[PDB]
Design a protein around this ligand. Structure first.
Ligand SMILES: [Zn+2]
Ligand SMILES: [Zn+2]
Ligand SMILES: [Zn+2]
Lengths: 513, 512, 513
């Protein structure tokens, strides 16, 4: 009996940019993703999914280890992932699968096990040990640019200028002008061709493949025709306080980011404050973001076609997800940082082999990126490792939400200094005191900071997190309650590596409950 | 020439230190002349706690500088991941031989030793990274063989040496001596190993962990210590109306009242730990002081040798206990649960030379995890990045650093081990069988992972009888303490590699 | 300031197929290698280089760890390489260089660090830990066949039938017909393409690249026009004994190989004994073999072009070599097996940076495959690891053969049973007794078997190893001496990982001599 797994991981794709969910609420989608729509219609779409941390580094450690950031300790980009942790790659090998990966993991190696001069200590990060690279973005995007260059397209002196907007009158920033690279040499095409190459090599033998897409990560410019596909005026408006300073008044960490986030990190060549973008420009960006999205969908179309032609579609567990979200103007922020819901809320669509008993349904239960790894391993016939914080989602594909499933969503962020951003200057704390965790449900959200003020939100009254109730004596019992939940969640999720073992007079044994 | 002598007694309560009784205006109800010497020449810390219980957790913390939340040796019989740097490994790194006497009750790491390994057969064994120079060993064979080799005839069942004298003497709280003379006591044994080690060193610099088993039970003493102290001159137990009144406070208290047995505290006895009368509890307390005095006599022997050989003034001497003991407080026997008497332990530090703070009594909030950093940096080393604890040296200089902790912290995990199954009582799986405590001079907040929490007003209710955590009027305070506890957890997440960075320039490191 | 190493490693390319050396000897070359000729013209050609063991797995382990087989213990294909041993990848990372690699290493993993179900324990071998893979043959050649499918070429049901000769009923075996794959999709073009991709991605940044070719490894069939590039009539005749049995009678190990080697392992779909190929058939094979070589040369052309275009040629150390030789019908043998010189004799050409001071010259010092790794590491500024048996060749590019250079060549072969061949059933020995070592110089060769008769050859009279003297009482003193040399070698090359260390009153110390 052949079983395949296709993990599709996009980067920076928000939860609320999924047509199938828009349609269930009664809205007409403002973008098109027909191939995703097929996955959706044929599988289970998760409405309330979060990555348990951001940015890419931490988010991928959580995704590829089943561990919360509090256990995996890859707290930011550039911070080492301890190699004691069992990653998805190493686990799949232990059950006979070859862990093929396309994309990147943005992982910083363990310094105890590699030379200080290792080139990998020179970039944000590199591919996690334990996977087989079959199409790397590679440090500095070299895999891609080499591939562009070997395809006979002549790149500019400064290679990233392929993402300047086209035409010698066009200002960098939000744009309706295409990029300077053709769609047949887009990074999304690059990864897709690597998938097709790999799958064709396999020639019907069972596979695991992590298919990583860079998009819709910035820079926010798209190859033709995706640049003009959608109109600014059809995009939803950003949700924000009256001006950048009103937003900044909420919390010191909010202020650092409002005061520090640059347009140049989201639009190639652009200059100035991300927070000072006007509504018109955010709308345009947003439409470019929709283009990038639809290109991925066109791309998934090719991968699905090859599975159909080779009779593999019904043999394959396809999971579609993102590593993290993106502010996209919400609360005057660009990117993924801080405590706001849009940075953590990501899509999850799972299509079982065969005809899916819940095909087309929308699951409301609270899932977390740490759940993916246990799901895959259980589905391929293996055990969920003891150390994992996450739990297999497979019951959702069966009877439904287990009776003891989590009742709140959990996520974390660590803002200690790295080489390109120094929150600690703004916040005046040392690195071991720069974190927060979040506890959220249908009615409230509590953000607790290691050593700064807490935030509490009535999501019925204030669903966009504008009014901190945390200092209001009238809410003492409620904030108590949520602090207590958060505390119990920590206690219950201390490291589990060896805590199930026991010496006894009858020798070493294991406890299963 | 710098020496370190770490005396770790077992089960010795914070509030059985004469020096502190005297400062409080009381007449010591026991005598510890030698420890009294240390306190007079040194600093006594009055608010010191072990960050967990029982003996393997407490010692993992003590010997790694890590809270239970990071060392994960959450109970006796639960393995200690060997990734964690221990005191002995650290000492070797700064050129000290980590000589150890007694025991650490450490369960080894399954990933680095065979399942058939004999050490997975006992509660625990000496920790990797030390030089054993006098092992209680597993099953206490090191001691027993020493008794046998000294020519003392042992009974069929060896532990019957701690049956009380006389074939008509009732096992239990007893006024009769043990069936072994003091010259073959376990405390005499450990002391003889200590003296052998020290004399072998012949003046060369030294680290030594001098472990004693006492006042661990059984609560029975060699002559004359059985009689030395009187049950009429002991402090009364502080407890509720009856077992059930106390049981009713919390489901874990119920578990322990309902299950602690007398045989775990007096050899061959049986019946319930909770149902001892105040008369019996006081007799027990008399035996305990006896065993305490016997340790003091022993340390006299070890201190004497230090004086003779000119080493006393070079030797950082640290006196402490792995954990406390209820002694019938709250109808409990042992070191379990959340009550302060299981966690409050002694700490007395005598520096080299003349002590700037000789005889003084420190009030700052110290924790067992601080001991290791203290030793290491005293001998010229660094405090490892990974340690939750902090060096105590500033207290022996100018005093409490302006950024010292303002609360005490301690944890307890009560998952099923092979001789007690609290999961049956409280109906939780193992990963939810834990609590942490957060305590200052005014309140204490005991938070459970999956049972109702406890909150006490320490002024009005210094002995933890009236849970206030469900009083709506207390919402804001109970929040505050959950809030502190939550910040402590966040702030004390594992730090092994979280200080490193990659950069355009290569691998670097943040100090702050 | 800028320093590149390109290590080119071909497979099964004999040392006596190097035009530069043939011209030096006075012979008109029977094949063409202009691009290799350029390296020779500009660099140093070593006429007496050997691989210290065969076949692929073991030879590569030696090449890439600097260790003799007596120390790396990867004694055959399928046998694990202990990971305690430090390889080229790991060394390079420790001096700041990315260990990019193309091709394959056929390394069996270390079972103590990897699960028993790891799919890498299912193939002959896979890529060695420590290298970055930027162009894998992959297990099964999937990487290549994936790249052919994706180029739009329609592969047969049994993919490997691309190497059946052209035509409805051309007889498999030594052939003059082309293969059924166009040259634009040959394996040689695949490895090349991946090379160019890699270099184009680097974009001037210093690099290390292991550029591996599969050719001229069998099957012996070539894409058009390489199939008819050379004529049987012009190919050197095989050197062999009068008949197979006569060859067999020299030693039980030879007899086992004569009796078991099949034409199918060298011509795809062929049947019969490789031993029984007549000389016409062998000459045909030799011609096709030259076919594949010149295809490689053509390919090195494109790579050298790109270094020339980009101004990198003068900044690049280029080392050209092979993992092992090939009997190519000599002694009635096909493959790389036993003790004969042609299985071990391999090419080495080294072009230093700048204008080489020994350009064109031919070095005669005895070099071994183990010396390559130290050479590269010293040239890049690092140190020769203390464990290495090999020694740096850079003095040859400076003043010349060091005054204490080895005075003999050493190589080894272990013939314990593997899944696809079982010499233990022929020679009746247990696996720890199934080895030989060779010691050879310009005048004598000694072959020492662990548990079979030894062999001794006078190479002036009998340069082709036909007349074993080892049992002639008149050579007892000479055999003694060579056995004594062999013994002294074993003793002086015992594992050095930690033997330079000492405890002392002062603490831990190191002894440099
Ligand atoms: Zn990302
Ligand atoms: Zn203890
Ligand atoms: Zn080979």
């Amino acid at each position: 009996t052949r079983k395949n797994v296709l993990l599709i991981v996009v980067d920076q794709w928000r939860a609320d940019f999924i047509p199938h969910l828009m349609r269930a609420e009664g809205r007409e989608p403002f973008l098109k993703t027909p191939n995703l729509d097929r996955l959706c219609r044929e599988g289970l779409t998760f409405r309330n999914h979060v990555t348990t941390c951001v940015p890419g580094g931490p988010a991928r450690a959580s995704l590829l280890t089943g561990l919360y950031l509090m256990n995996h300790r890859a707290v930011q980009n550039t911070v080492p992932l301890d190699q004691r942790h069992l990653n998805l790659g190493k686990a799949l090998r232990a059950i006979g699968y070859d862990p093929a990966l396309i994309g990147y993991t943005t992982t910083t190696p363990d310094p105890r096990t590699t030379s200080a001069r290792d080139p990998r200590f020179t970039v944000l990060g590199d591919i996690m040990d334990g996977f087989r690279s079959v199409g790397a973005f590679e440090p500095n995007m070299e895999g891609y640019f080499g591939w562009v260059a070997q395809n006979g397209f002549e790149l500019p002196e400064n290679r990233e200028d392929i993402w300047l907007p086209e035409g010698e009158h066009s200002v960098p920033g939000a744009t309706d002008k295409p990029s300077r690279i053709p769609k047949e040499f887009s990074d999304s095409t690059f990864f897709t061709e690597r998938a097709l190459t790999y799958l064709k090599g396999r020639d019907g033998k069972p596979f695991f493949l992590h298919l990583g897409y860079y998009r819709p990560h910035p820079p926010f410019v798209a190859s033709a025709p995706y640049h003009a596909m959608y109109k600014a005026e059809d995009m939803p408006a950003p949700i924000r306080a009256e001006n950048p300073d009103a937003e900044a008044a909420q919390h010191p960490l909010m202020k650092h980011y409002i005061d520090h986030i640059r347009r140049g990190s989201f639009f190639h060549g652009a200059e100035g404050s991300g927070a000072t973008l006007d509504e018109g420009e955010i709308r345009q960006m947003r439409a470019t973001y929709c283009g990038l999205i639809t290109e991925i969908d066109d791309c998934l179309g090719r991968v699905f076609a090859y599975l159909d032609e080779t009779g593999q579609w019904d043999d394959t567990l396809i999971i579609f997800t993102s590593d993290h979200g993106e502010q996209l103007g919400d609360h005057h922020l660009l990117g993924k940082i801080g405590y706001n819901a849009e940075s953590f809320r990501i899509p999850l669509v799972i299509k079982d082999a065969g005809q899916n008993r819940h095909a087309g349904q929308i699951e409301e239960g609270f899932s977390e990126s740490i759940d993916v790894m246990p799901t895959i391993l259980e589905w391929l016939g293996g055990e969920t490792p003891r150390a994992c914080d996450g739990r297999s989602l497979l019951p959702f594909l069966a009877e439904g939400k287990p009776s003891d499933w989590r009742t709140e969503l959990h996520y974390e962020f660590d803002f200690r200094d790295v080489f390109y951003d120094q929150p600690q200057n703004s916040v005046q704390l040392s690195q071991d005191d720069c974190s927060l965790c979040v506890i959220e449900d249908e009615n409230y959200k509590y953000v607790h900071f290691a050593a700064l003020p807490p935030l509490f939100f009535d999501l019925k009254a204030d669903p966009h997190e504008f009014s901190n109730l945390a200092g209001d004596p009238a809410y003492a019992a409620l904030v108590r309650d949520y602090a207590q939940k958060a505390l119990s969640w920590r206690l219950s999720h201390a490291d589990r590596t060896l805590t199930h073992y026991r010496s006894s007079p009858q020798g070493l044994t294991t406890r299963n409950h």
